[PDB]
Amino acid sequence: NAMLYPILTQSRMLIDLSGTWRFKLDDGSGFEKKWYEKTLDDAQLMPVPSSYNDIKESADLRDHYGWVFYQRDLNIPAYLKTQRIVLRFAAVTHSAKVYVNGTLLCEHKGGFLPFETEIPENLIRDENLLTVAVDNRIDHSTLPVGREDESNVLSFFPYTPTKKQNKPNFDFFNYCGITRPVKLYTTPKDAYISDITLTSSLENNTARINYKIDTKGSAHTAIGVYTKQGVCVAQTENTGTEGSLTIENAVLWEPLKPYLYEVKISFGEDRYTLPYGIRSVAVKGNKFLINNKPFYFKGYGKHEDTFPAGRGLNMPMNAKDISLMKWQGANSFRTSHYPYSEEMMRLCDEEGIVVIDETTAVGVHLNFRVNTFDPIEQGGIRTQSHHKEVIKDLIARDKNHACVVMWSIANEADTGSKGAYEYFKPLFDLARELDPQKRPCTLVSLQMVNYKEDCTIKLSDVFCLNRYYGWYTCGADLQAAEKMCREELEFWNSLGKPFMYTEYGADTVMGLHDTTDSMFTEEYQVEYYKTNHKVTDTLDCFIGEQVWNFADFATSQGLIRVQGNKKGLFTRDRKPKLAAHYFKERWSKIPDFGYK
Amino acid sequence: AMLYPILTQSRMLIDLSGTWRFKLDDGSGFEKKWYEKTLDDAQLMPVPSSYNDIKESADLRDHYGWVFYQRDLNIPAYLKTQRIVLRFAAVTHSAKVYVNGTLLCEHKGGFLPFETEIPENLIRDENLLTVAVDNRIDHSTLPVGREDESNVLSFFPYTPTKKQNKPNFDFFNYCGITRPVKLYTTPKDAYISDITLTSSLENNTARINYKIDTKGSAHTAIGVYTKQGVCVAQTENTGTEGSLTIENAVLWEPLKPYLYEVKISFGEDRYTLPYGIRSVAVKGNKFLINNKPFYFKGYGKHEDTFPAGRGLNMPMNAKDISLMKWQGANSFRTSHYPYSEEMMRLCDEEGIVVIDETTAVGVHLNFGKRVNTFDPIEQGGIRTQSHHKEVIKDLIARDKNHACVVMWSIANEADTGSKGAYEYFKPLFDLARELDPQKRPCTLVSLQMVNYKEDCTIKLSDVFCLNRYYGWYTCGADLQAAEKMCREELEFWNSLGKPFMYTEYGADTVMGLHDTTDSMFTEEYQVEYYKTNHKVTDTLDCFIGEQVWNFADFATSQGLIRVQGNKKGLFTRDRKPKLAAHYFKERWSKIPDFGYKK
Numbered sequence A: 001n002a003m004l005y006p007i008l009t010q011s012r013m014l015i016d017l018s019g020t021w022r023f024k025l026d027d028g029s030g031f032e033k034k035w036y037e038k039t040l041d042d043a044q045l046m047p048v049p050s051s052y053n054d055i056k057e058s059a060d061l062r063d064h065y066g067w068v069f070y071q072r073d074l075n076i077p078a079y080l081k082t083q084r085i086v087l088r089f090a091a092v093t094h095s096a097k098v099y100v101n102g103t104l105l106c107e108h109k110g111g112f113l114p115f116e117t118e119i120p121e122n123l124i125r126d127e128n129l130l131t132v133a134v135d136n137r138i139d140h141s142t143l144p145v146g147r148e149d150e151s152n153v154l155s156f157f158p159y160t161p162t163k164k165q166n167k168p169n170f171d172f173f174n175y176c177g178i179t180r181p182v183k184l185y186t187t188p189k190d191a192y193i194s195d196i197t198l199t200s201s202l203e204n205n206t207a208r209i210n211y212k213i214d215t216k217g218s219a220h221t222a223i224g225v226y227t228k229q230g231v232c233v234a235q236t237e238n239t240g241t242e243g244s245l246t247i248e249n250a251v252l253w254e255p256l257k258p259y260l261y262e263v264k265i266s267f268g269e270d271r272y273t274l275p276y277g278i279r280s281v282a283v284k285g286n287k288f289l290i291n292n293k294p295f296y297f298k299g300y301g302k303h304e305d306t307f308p309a310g311r312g313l314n315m316p317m318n319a320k321d322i323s324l325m326k327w328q329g330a331n332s333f334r335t336s337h338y339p340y341s342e343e344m345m346r347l348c349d350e351e352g353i354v355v356i357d358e359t360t361a362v363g364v365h366l367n368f369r370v371n372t373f374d375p376i377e378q379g380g381i382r383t384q385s386h387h388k389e390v391i392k393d394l395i396a397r398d399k400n401h402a403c404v405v406m407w408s409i410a411n412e413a414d415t416g417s418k419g420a421y422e423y424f425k426p427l428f429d430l431a432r433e434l435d436p437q438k439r440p441c442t443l444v445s446l447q448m449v450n451y452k453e454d455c456t457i458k459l460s461d462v463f464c465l466n467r468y469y470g471w472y473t474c475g476a477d478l479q480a481a482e483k484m485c486r487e488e489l490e491f492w493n494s495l496g497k498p499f500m501y502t503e504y505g506a507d508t509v510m511g512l513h514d515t516t517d518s519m520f521t522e523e524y525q526v527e528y529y530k531t532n533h534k535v536t537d538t539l540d541c542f543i544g545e546q547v548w549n550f551a552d553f554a555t556s557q558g559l560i561r562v563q564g565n566k567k568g569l570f571t572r573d574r575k576p577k578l579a580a581h582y583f584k585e586r587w588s589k590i591p592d593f594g595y596k
Numbered sequence B: 001a002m003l004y005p006i007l008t009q010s011r012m013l014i015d016l017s018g019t020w021r022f023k024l025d026d027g028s029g030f031e032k033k034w035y036e037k038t039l040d041d042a043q044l045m046p047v048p049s050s051y052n053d054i055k056e057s058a059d060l061r062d063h064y065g066w067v068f069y070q071r072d073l074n075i076p077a078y079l080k081t082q083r084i085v086l087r088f089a090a091v092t093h094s095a096k097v098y099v100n101g102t103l104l105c106e107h108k109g110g111f112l113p114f115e116t117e118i119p120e121n122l123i124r125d126e127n128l129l130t131v132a133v134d135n136r137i138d139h140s141t142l143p144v145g146r147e148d149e150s151n152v153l154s155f156f157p158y159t160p161t162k163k164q165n166k167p168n169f170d171f172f173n174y175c176g177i178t179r180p181v182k183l184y185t186t187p188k189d190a191y192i193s194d195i196t197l198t199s200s201l202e203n204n205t206a207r208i209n210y211k212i213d214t215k216g217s218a219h220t221a222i223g224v225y226t227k228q229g230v231c232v233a234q235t236e237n238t239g240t241e242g243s244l245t246i247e248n249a250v251l252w253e254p255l256k257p258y259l260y261e262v263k264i265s266f267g268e269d270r271y272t273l274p275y276g277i278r279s280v281a282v283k284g285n286k287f288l289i290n291n292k293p294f295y296f297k298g299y300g301k302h303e304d305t306f307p308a309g310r311g312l313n314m315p316m317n318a319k320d321i322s323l324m325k326w327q328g329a330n331s332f333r334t335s336h337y338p339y340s341e342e343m344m345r346l347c348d349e350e351g352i353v354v355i356d357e358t359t360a361v362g363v364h365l366n367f368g369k370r371v372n373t374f375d376p377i378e379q380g381g382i383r384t385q386s387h388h389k390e391v392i393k394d395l396i397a398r399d400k401n402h403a404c405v406v407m408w409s410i411a412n413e414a415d416t417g418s419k420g421a422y423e424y425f426k427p428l429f430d431l432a433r434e435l436d437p438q439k440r441p442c443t444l445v446s447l448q449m450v451n452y453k454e455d456c457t458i459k460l461s462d463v464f465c466l467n468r469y470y471g472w473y474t475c476g477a478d479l480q481a482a483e484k485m486c487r488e489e490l491e492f493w494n495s496l497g498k499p500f501m502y503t504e505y506g507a508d509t510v511m512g513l514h515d516t517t518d519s520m521f522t523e524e525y526q527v528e529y530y531k532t533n534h535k536v537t538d539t540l541d542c543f544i545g546e547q548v549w550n551f552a553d554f555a556t557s558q559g560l561i562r563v564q565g566n567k568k569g570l571f572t573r574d575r576k577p578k579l580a581a582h583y584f585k586e587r588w589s590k591i592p593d594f595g596y597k598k
């Protein structure tokens, strides 16, 4: 469960296994014929990390259904065997089977969170083959959810598909493969650090770090806290597993003004250094408080999506995206609709970007007659069990990030229907139990005629609304959109708790224009946002605006998707639309703290 | 004299526009007298329109020389009792007009109207109307063409396949029957040939001085009616000159037009002229319209739309005016040639101020011995002055009564910083001032030059109109440098104490190109370019106007710096707003038409 980010330390090797791997589509016989026991024959080459769907020009590759096999050679020095040898997969989408030589080492379900496995030393021969089989199939038991009929979420006349294909119950393309880096790392065999938990206490004008260090084996523990320049500001040797350290002259991590201490931990020979921002988060009344100050979210729902790697880790684009958000005056984004790479989370900690951290739970809705949360034995959704593992794993991975201020339990589940509360109650209970910082929890609310029956009202600390007044309703009638927006949002405002837009927007094709309200035009995108803001700016409990979307991104094919989703403020190659300049202006006049 | 043809109780108006026959000259069309017979093995061509872009043929688009238009003209014999006139609103560049193989008139100059009577003895039961149209330009035409086969915009020399017009200007050489051809009639014996109005405000009373030019003997009557139809002045049997007064006259104002109806009668002849009452005066560093300090907000335009080229496009005229009101503009310049009468009449009706410009662009021979632009014709200098005088005469004759016209532009980017320039232009300025009854300000539009203090506009113009490209043709992608060099020069102009303005400034911008970091040709750079210029101009009290280059992308000759034409529009060629169009809507919404710099 514990998943420390792998780093090069005095006690820990870090070997990146990324590069060109061999790649072979499964044809139904791949496991029967035990392809993982030899070199892949008649194979292609595929970059790792990357989604595989867009690297070639093959529609059958892009739209492949089922398994693929990745493989590479792994010839490592024998003196590594004096250490504990670990294979870390930061993400394999959606499910993986990992083989070393002929031998199945592990299997994983869930395409967006890391997993790892020791390599037993009796298995390492002189030359080794690493094989990773990757399953892309989605159904009523996976997160994200796939449809199990021939229905498309986006048809006039019915037809029989040529081949079976995944049918996403979500509005983004089903990019799969070895999405994020594969690495080999080592620790001391006999005594090593397995996890680190840090929390902050700011009471009585005294900043303290509380630590809890999880180990394997028997040794002595030490912890030191260091400034960015390397001055030790607190340290203790031969400590317990738990304790606290006072940080005199503590500098707080603040949105757009990050400060990270370096927390170095020793256990026997093992050494691990964890960056850590000191800050508090709390919901009080109708305010979202960061370091006891009333925060206003300004930003976006995002996607991990770039050409040609798809969902694949793209670190230059990560840095470019954060630079664009600072240029635009944003302070935050949400990990729509899955955990993002640790490289992104760590960069956000470094750059002072606030993150709403979301699970993989999109598509938990069977009625976009069996109801979504009917009993499984009557056709209800089969995701609750995996939904708990995802929450456990997500919090275990990201718990120490200062940038994470809120957990989002699901995106647009069927939360107005019968049984939703009972499905979601244990998941909220679990997230509150597991997060040592006890951060606020929410689910992101689907737009819905019976919004007063949204079970978010009974569960969430912040109400997060996805609303499309002026796009999916009142299209090209913004005066009607304004009225419909005000009627519903005055209800939410009357509940006295913080609420916010986590999505709102309008599909906009760069280069289409009209001085007169016309859907898909750059001007309409601006007018859409002006209309919504006319309402939200008058509501004192509305504490944040995150647009849909930061940038255009790939989706499944359909009559309402113009080469993907076009609601980005930026294009897929990160060029500003008219509305992106509109937001730079607007967000320049709105402070991070004390707007409402 | 050139009154706008209208339908009246005494005047037929028959539009001959439509599909005409069309044939390229192969070098034998005059020798074989194609105008004597139905054109043979011909195409069809819409009239009015430029003919260059109607088909798909480079040889058509880039034709050098003559073409022949032709249609049948079968007119009712009843009209033989009337005087019958063929009016050509514009034929670009030069024309020879034949009826039934008899040459009736020729005309030089592609953007001003001309007419001829059809002799009654020439009219048969069936008639042919043939118009031969010359597209060639050289050192004697306005606009000026180069005579050296070089491009005004090559890295390695080459021999051209065919001889082509080489413009000495930055816009495509669209030719053809650009504006409507109409047949109209008047009485034979006595008819009105011209009308001249001037006005003077005495408290709230306007005095309208009139001169009515006529042919024949009869009695002249003039009447002035409100829009709603109430007579508010009338005098009978007044002869040629005279005056009359309007009590509590509604004045014509920018963006708040008011037009009276002036009804003239002479014998049987009847003509109605719309007329707005307003004053124009330069006083100090002020441009006074109705005695208030005006600030120009607008553009240099072109008459340019797809596929008609330069051709009259009346829906797009209304669209463009509607866009300027959307953007908050109040004015434009007719760069670089007189526009259609239909645009000018619409500007009067909509309240848009116009700087009316002659065709004189390219008067610059230094843009086996080197030559000076204004050397003697014998010594190789430019040969345009005599035609230049005729263009000034005809332009003012056509447009003198427009309330919207507030300033005459004698030339665009001529060689005004070289020797002889003053001697070329002084008679033209004197000519313009002599012939305009309203005595409106005169300017020449000044090319960017290193020796700008030597520009002869300083000796001649009432307003200094500058074309400057700080941040585009100089200091490109160095907008800090642009701001410093802009300030250094404009402070000089500001120190002269007379009104000055930008008549051009801009940056080629391809819709859909973007960058957050300053990069030429991107939409963001266009905005930053303009912001940098306004940092300077907004601090200079004599700077009384900003007209961008250009309203909309337009066609030009081909070259390595022309990205399918000129891309400096705030709007695309199909009138879609770039980022900078929205920037100017914001900027002009916060700048008043009057009293910005008071």
Ligand SMILES: O=C(O)c1cn(C2CC2)c2cc(N3C=CN([C@@H]4O[C@H](C(=O)O)[C@@H](O)[C@H](O)[C@H]4O)CC3)c(F)cc2c1=O
Pocket: A153, A154, A170, A171, A172, A337, A411, A412, A447, A466, A472, A503, A548, A560, A565, A567
């Ligand atoms: O053809 C139509 O008529 C409609 C089609 N679709 C589906 C997308 C094809 C609708 C979807 C609705 N929901 C689906 C996604 N929710 C968020 O919206 C973003 C977006 O759609 O841009 C997604 O990208 C985000 O991931 C997701 O969170 C919005 C609400 C809806 F309310 C109405 C319609 C239609 O009316």
Ligand SMILES: O=C(O)c1cn(C2CC2)c2cc(N3C=CN([C@@H]4O[C@H](C(=O)O)[C@@H](O)[C@H](O)[C@H]4O)CC3)c(F)cc2c1=O
Pocket: B154, B155, B156, B560
């Ligand atoms: O304004 C003009 O008239 C000319 C302008 N330039 C400018 C440099 C563009 C010329 C350049 C010449 N070189 C020609 C080929 N070089 C190759 O060509 C590519 C390209 O230019 O696309 C570059 O990208 C490659 O790196 C380089 O190997 C570049 C330069 C030239 F011969 C004439 C001109 C002009 O005549």
